[PDB]
Design a protein around this ligand. Sequence first.
Ligand SMILES: Nc1ncnc2c1ncn2[C@@H]1O[C@H](COP(=O)(O)O)[C@@H](O)[C@H]1O
Ligand SMILES: Nc1ncnc2c1ncn2[C@@H]1O[C@H](COP(=O)(O)O)[C@@H](O)[C@H]1O
Ligand SMILES: Nc1ncnc2c1ncn2[C@@H]1O[C@H](COP(=O)(O)O)[C@@H](O)[C@H]1O
Ligand SMILES: Nc1ncnc2c1ncn2[C@@H]1O[C@H](COP(=O)(O)O)[C@@H](O)[C@H]1O
Ligand SMILES: O=P(O)(O)OC[C@H]1O[C@](O)(COP(=O)(O)O)[C@@H](O)[C@@H]1O
Ligand SMILES: O=P(O)(O)OC[C@H]1O[C@](O)(COP(=O)(O)O)[C@@H](O)[C@@H]1O
Ligand SMILES: O=P(O)(O)OC[C@H]1O[C@](O)(COP(=O)(O)O)[C@@H](O)[C@@H]1O
Ligand SMILES: O=P(O)(O)OC[C@H]1O[C@](O)(COP(=O)(O)O)[C@@H](O)[C@@H]1O
Ligand SMILES: [Mg+2]
Ligand SMILES: [Mg+2]
Ligand SMILES: [Mg+2]
Ligand SMILES: [Mg+2]
Ligand SMILES: [Mg+2]
Ligand SMILES: [Mg+2]
Ligand SMILES: [Mg+2]
Ligand SMILES: [Mg+2]
Lengths: 319, 319, 319, 319
Amino acid sequence: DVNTLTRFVMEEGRKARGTGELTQLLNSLCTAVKAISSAVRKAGIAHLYGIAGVKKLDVLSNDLVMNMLKSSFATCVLVSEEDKHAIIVEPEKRGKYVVCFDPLDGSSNIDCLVSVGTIFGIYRKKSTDEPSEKDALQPGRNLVAAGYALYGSATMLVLAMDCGVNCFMLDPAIGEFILVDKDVKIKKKGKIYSLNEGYAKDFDPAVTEYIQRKKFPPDNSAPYGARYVGSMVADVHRTLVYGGIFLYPANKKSPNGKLRLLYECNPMAYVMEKAGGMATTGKEAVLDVIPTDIHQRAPVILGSPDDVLEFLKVYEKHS
Amino acid sequence: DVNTLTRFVMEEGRKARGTGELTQLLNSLCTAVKAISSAVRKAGIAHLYGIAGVKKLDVLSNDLVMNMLKSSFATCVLVSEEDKHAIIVEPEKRGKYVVCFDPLDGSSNIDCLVSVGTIFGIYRKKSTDEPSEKDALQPGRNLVAAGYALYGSATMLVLAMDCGVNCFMLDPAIGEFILVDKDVKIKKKGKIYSLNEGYAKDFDPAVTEYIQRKKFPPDNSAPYGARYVGSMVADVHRTLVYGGIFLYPANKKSPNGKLRLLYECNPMAYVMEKAGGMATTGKEAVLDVIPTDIHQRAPVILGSPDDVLEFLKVYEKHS
Amino acid sequence: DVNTLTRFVMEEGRKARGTGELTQLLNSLCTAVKAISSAVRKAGIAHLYGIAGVKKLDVLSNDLVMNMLKSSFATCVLVSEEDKHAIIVEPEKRGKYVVCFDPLDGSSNIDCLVSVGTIFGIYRKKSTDEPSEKDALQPGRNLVAAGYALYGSATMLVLAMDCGVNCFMLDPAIGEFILVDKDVKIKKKGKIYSLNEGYAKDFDPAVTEYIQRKKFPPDNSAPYGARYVGSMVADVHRTLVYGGIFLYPANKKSPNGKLRLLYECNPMAYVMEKAGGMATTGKEAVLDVIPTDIHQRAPVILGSPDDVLEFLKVYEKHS
Amino acid sequence: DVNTLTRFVMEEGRKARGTGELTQLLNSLCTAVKAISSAVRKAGIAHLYGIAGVKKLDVLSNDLVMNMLKSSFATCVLVSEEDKHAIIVEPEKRGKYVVCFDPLDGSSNIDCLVSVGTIFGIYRKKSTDEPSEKDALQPGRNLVAAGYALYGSATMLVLAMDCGVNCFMLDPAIGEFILVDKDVKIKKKGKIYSLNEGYAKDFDPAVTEYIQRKKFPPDNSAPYGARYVGSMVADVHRTLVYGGIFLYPANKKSPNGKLRLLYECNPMAYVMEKAGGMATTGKEAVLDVIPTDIHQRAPVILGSPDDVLEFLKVYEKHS
Ligand SMILES: Nc1ncnc2c1ncn2[C@@H]1O[C@H](COP(=O)(O)O)[C@@H](O)[C@H]1O
Ligand SMILES: Nc1ncnc2c1ncn2[C@@H]1O[C@H](COP(=O)(O)O)[C@@H](O)[C@H]1O
Ligand SMILES: Nc1ncnc2c1ncn2[C@@H]1O[C@H](COP(=O)(O)O)[C@@H](O)[C@H]1O
Ligand SMILES: Nc1ncnc2c1ncn2[C@@H]1O[C@H](COP(=O)(O)O)[C@@H](O)[C@H]1O
Ligand SMILES: O=P(O)(O)OC[C@H]1O[C@](O)(COP(=O)(O)O)[C@@H](O)[C@@H]1O
Ligand SMILES: O=P(O)(O)OC[C@H]1O[C@](O)(COP(=O)(O)O)[C@@H](O)[C@@H]1O
Ligand SMILES: O=P(O)(O)OC[C@H]1O[C@](O)(COP(=O)(O)O)[C@@H](O)[C@@H]1O
Ligand SMILES: O=P(O)(O)OC[C@H]1O[C@](O)(COP(=O)(O)O)[C@@H](O)[C@@H]1O
Ligand SMILES: [Mg+2]
Ligand SMILES: [Mg+2]
Ligand SMILES: [Mg+2]
Ligand SMILES: [Mg+2]
Ligand SMILES: [Mg+2]
Ligand SMILES: [Mg+2]
Ligand SMILES: [Mg+2]
Ligand SMILES: [Mg+2]
């Protein structure tokens, strides 16, 4: 029988004997995702082109998530890609939770109408101190909930908590996220590798050899296919649904990768581990990295466990 | 001054001194595209999941186009990816046009929600009385119009005719395509290359060398960036919008290429040429291939003229 | 065969051998109506209530019809209830048609969410001097097309021409008006009467007597049911679809009624007659009044011919 | 700050320190209302008219409320205009609440696109017996919550509880009910009376005299205006919003009134009293009537307190 995100999250809160504060936070996030979706699909674009005779989506998306998270009364510290410093919620609206998000991921793909998305990770504040930026410098092991919305051919919200990974399709006729994939697990091994090979000149030798194994298998088998949308949400989601591997490794220029630990790599690493996949920087599990800067980058290699393991094997040889 | 697709096409038809039959065909196709977009964005999916207590998308898309074109009274021969032979329109609903289309391109990977699209090409028939599939076996240079709808982060219709290429954004709030880019032209030279490098082991020596020049430039310029969504409409539309080059060349599993000439390669070659770009098979312009089978494949290299020229210099070396 | 409003107007124009100007006018009206429908249904209301941390509907509606008609290149004079003088279209955008319209009928009614609508009538300019207000002072008999959009439980457009009356339902999933009632004809006699009985103290004695025959039928048949939405478009649409009588009659406090001749009475009077109905002031056919003010009022009694004739019999008796 | 129905209801639930069962109940109802709204506005009607080559709205709406309420796990007994006997939820899905509802109200107005609605009343099961139709025969006084959805020019949900009455506007761009009117109170005295005067021949003398005081005021102030949409939800909501009085008194076809006590009269009476208005049968307060039949009928007079009292004075004089 049918299940909605609103009802699924409410029942989970009841099972967990929560006070309803994280439930209100998720409710507010789901609302914001729906309004971002509506804007990404360009509803109302006709009023921008004179049909009756204004703000970039990056900014609007951030404002939507910021205001909805603030007005939830569930959050104290908010970290966003769009903000230099962490936002400390005024004390009247303060709750226990720390949220790191990317309100619109995939900026290079906005103008060509390729898939984009929203990423989020949720922490419970651990300090006794006044809430500050330091409450967001937790390792991803500490995540309480994380996931993303994909604004692709359809809009899907993927939500991961300790109970597992669940996928919800947004039905736009009724503005309702519908549970369509329950307790999702990733394939043990896939057949697609995903990275920007235009950086090949700057590749670490382990990355160079790994990719070469994908195109010219030593085990006679057939070569992997290649995909790279250029939007982390789209590429990571395909990895979940299809299996395979995704890599934004440290290249000569970016010696710590490009993607941001708090609101891109950690949320995706958490979805992956909860789905029976893996997420490594090469040196360690992504969720084991202890950050020191809220905007700090990390290298990320993630996906099916047989694939990540094969990469790590190559990486160990080279180190 | 605001303009819609319905009004734009109608005025261009008045300037053309058309009898209205092609305009009626194009209205019908755009209605179909709006209904494909709705299904693709998963409107009503809550009913499939039991909200009140099943046709595949590409089958439903085909039915939408087939029915809207037949009932336009403008067509006589219809070629689709999903039908073995050409559909001859029943006599009472016959007009003069031939339409070759892919109703849902990239549809095999719809399961991961990556962008998807509809591609179409329109010809005037050559036959005089009974139409046949011979009316579809024309070279792309005979196209009267061609285009595509992209179901991406937003839905956009790109329409090309002799007058040039125009882009329309679907405003879902009112179901109108809004003219947002008129008389579009690709940039002379781009910075993105797009192909499935997973087939590298099977590349012709010309493709191997060209891709090598993009990753390790001879003149030590910046290497190109790589993008491969895996859906032709998405990869081609980005090529139109951002410039660069898109390749689906011959490999082992596909020695004449994989993409279909009539309703994948030819309509995109036409869009590209009308925007000042190029589309080649390597040996000849795509639009000059004379087809002998409605489902025949063709290699395709397309995009910015400087990039396609640079590929063709490498190709002529290996003749 | 499925038919859309666009395709139906377009084929009607080709059958009438029109040059495309009227078709372009109606296309523009269609687009404006879908945009009004969207604002009436409160799309985007969440932004006015600060979800991301402003025209009134009658004003927005007027701007939409005004802008879409001007940019149609099909009109020279535009009369609106929201503007004191006729609007003269700038010479570069001038067509040959005169449009009188009420952009959002049902004022008493917006705040309580009851049905509202748009009424329009279209004349061809008869004079050969430069477009002026006098070009709109034509009797309804000269109408080339008229009709209305109803924003009710669903949105529907009713379009009347010489060919007859047709009804189109707006499907909001795809933003297409769908032909659902062709060549509509009104019942010869209804069972509903529609007027504001709160004015009973001021009624013309004929209206008093006529309403008494509907509550106390002298043949001892069933009394009529009463319905008075208070929104002309809703009450007259129901009159059209169910049969019956709608009255906004002259009393002595308002010897010309309340409703406006040019953009309320004449359009519904024309829709009625083309459906086999009637529409009278009590003294003459509404469509036969020669207006002298673009805002002059007219009494109306309209609906099923048996009912209207029943009323005129009572009216003649009081003379 | 912006507030949604999902967030308001959850916050009121946390305050009352509920277990979340009632909150799940209202969530499911909210989702059903949205899906009914989408069907009422004829989303997807194009597919019913053959765009690609079914129930009455009554049945579908019932199936939507019925299935959503069952799957909430919050209910044990369900009573609906569309079902002869009370439905007893299977024990695995049983909660403690009893819900009586009209899933689509205003049946005579469906076909002419006039406003229609949904009405609901929520009781807690008092008896500790096996759940039965008996558990629904409580007087309105015992109502935990009630309200209605109006599918008018826009869709609005009106929800009443001990805490008061609140109004939520459906934003269809995002499928979210947005709090727009808080703690609503009706005017002390209105200027509109609402009833079907078609039954004038059957009215009792109290009703006849009250209506005569509204058309011919003894104090010689201005007569009230008349409005009768013919859908109870629409007329009752205009009564809440503008003030005045709504009447469905006994007539010859309906000697105990037409409107039904459990799922029409009691919810609207409850909303009225929580807003500072009144609702009587003429003999008692609606909320005081102890029902013996789940489909039993009652006459009803409701609106601004002064108007209901002025009618009651007339009713008292006629004794
Ligand atoms: N909707 C929920 N779904 C899953 N787990 C929840 C939920 N709500 C609360 N929890 C768990 O219970 C803890 C306390 O909840 P709270 O009282 O809302 O802060 C959370 O940090 C989660 O570990
Ligand atoms: N809307 C239109 N826009 C641009 N060219 C058109 C249009 N309609 C017709 N034409 C041109 O006129 C030819 C004949 O039109 P038709 O009479 O409708 O078949 C077409 O094949 C086009 O070359
Ligand atoms: N779509 C149409 N439907 C019905 N009649 C039309 C249509 N278009 C034009 N006509 C008729 O033809 C006349 C001239 O059309 P036009 O050349 O567009 O101004 C109009 O005034 C109408 O009488
Ligand atoms: N969202 C809510 N809003 C207002 N009151 C509520 C709410 N939820 C529960 N209550 C009150 O608390 C009682 C018990 O709640 P529950 O355990 O959900 O059945 C209800 O019957 C109401 O009186
Ligand atoms: O062009 P590149 O260097 O391959 O970068 C693509 C990656 O950058 C990103 O776009 C970074 O996110 P932003 O768009 O927010 O800057 C990722 O989504 C994506 O994986
Ligand atoms: O997986 P590959 O071998 O790279 O092929 C991808 C190409 O095939 C296609 O998916 C063909 O489209 P369809 O299969 O949907 O007809 C193109 O969209 C795409 O360019
Ligand atoms: O309240 P009244 O006097 O009975 O008048 C109602 C009539 O006035 C109108 O509201 C006039 O239209 P406007 O709202 O544009 O003034 C009609 O819709 C309606 O039939
Ligand atoms: O035609 P009448 O007798 O005035 O009936 C009107 C009343 O009947 C109803 O339609 C009865 O409700 P249903 O339409 O669900 O049967 C009420 O909505 C309305 O107030
Ligand atoms: Mg970003
Ligand atoms: Mg990002
Ligand atoms: Mg294809
Ligand atoms: Mg295809
Ligand atoms: Mg008005
Ligand atoms: Mg008006
Ligand atoms: Mg009812
Ligand atoms: Mg009913």
